[PDB]
Symmetry: C3
């Protein structure tokens, strides 16, 4: 939908069960480049939601538009007020759907290949593989290249 990088992002919080625990994967993907930020969180409150969002902005750049579901994360005042403070238009109107599946496929794989290493390690490996290793044909460019 986005015509350039950081025109329109999509965001979701999805659960990822691991070692008997359901983490909250905050996921931010750019709709033009496909570049992704992912944060693993214990909770889903406005602190973690804003913290996951800032981190995505840290890696990708500041977006103009963001689209999310009606999850409790993206309906809290704190988050809405955050977005209006820094001139980020936010609609609660799939790409994040597919992106979640890709991310989790890589997590499951990296945790299987290396069962003793932490979950943070597997998320870095998954992010780095998706953004900078996967060549998004036919352009030959990776998501990271197209974004920057």
């Amino acid at each position: 939908r986005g015509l350039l990088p950081n025109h329109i992002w999509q965001g979701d919080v999805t659960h990822y069960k691991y070692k008997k625990y359901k983490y909250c994967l905050h996921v931010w993907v750019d709709t033009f480049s496909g570049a992704v930020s992912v944060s693993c969180k214990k909770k889903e409150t406005s602190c973690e939601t804003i913290s996951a969002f800032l981190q995505a902005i840290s890696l990708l750049g500041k977006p103009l538009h963001i689209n999310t579901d009606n999850g409790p994360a993206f309906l809290s005042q704190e988050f809405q007020e955050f977005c209006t403070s820094y001139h980020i238009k936010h609609s609660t109107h799939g790409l994040v759907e597919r992106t979640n599946g890709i991310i989790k496929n890589l997590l499951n794989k990296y945790l299987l290949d290396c069962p003793n290493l932490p979950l943070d390690n597997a998320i870095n490996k998954a992010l780095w593989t998706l953004n900078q290793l996967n060549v998004m044909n036919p352009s030959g460019k990776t998501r990271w290249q197209i974004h920057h």
Copy 2:
């Protein structure tokens, strides 16, 4: 004062009291872009000062000139010798003053919004908000954009 990014930086070490403890905030701001690096340190010796400076170079790039106060951090031989080794002109001749206040305002806010999270978390959130979220009108550009 700087005509381009990394022409002239300013640097300061300021105290930030939190949970009964005074940390040393090493602060490096570029005088053209306004882009900032901040490191929280327990001490202010040449190890931490050089370590905070390298980190600023890690994020911003290598500067030609740096201006600091006569604090003990920027008068030690180790630091002076460091600067002369890597061709960085250093004068001990406000922007860092205002930058410290902005940084601390964000720290106080993020620690208030999320009292249970560590101080490192709040510093990342503060840095990311300042460099990449704040739009420095009238250009519409953020500090990070103008720097890179």
Copy 3:
């Protein structure tokens, strides 16, 4: 040998003895820019080798060619299969030799200057000094500048 950044990399695993322990330094250097990634690892198995390699790609970009020795790290199926999966040509055919020496000289220095700080700290300081502080005359550019 590389005509551009990320055309041809060289990679090595070398030992670095510190505090009675031999770490495995995975080292990835670009043959055109001289830009370097270094990861400290306890082991040398395919998990750590791929993890160190992804991190190098994370910082530098995806390479087309990589050249390594016949070390057990770069002969494992897991690593070979990894490379063929993501379209990275890998030969087991010096720059990494000199790069290892430079890196270790900086490690020895930073550990001497600051004996109480962790080894991770010294590796960051060494990497940042090499990539972004050292001016690679006569161009005046640093390795990081030439790479990006």
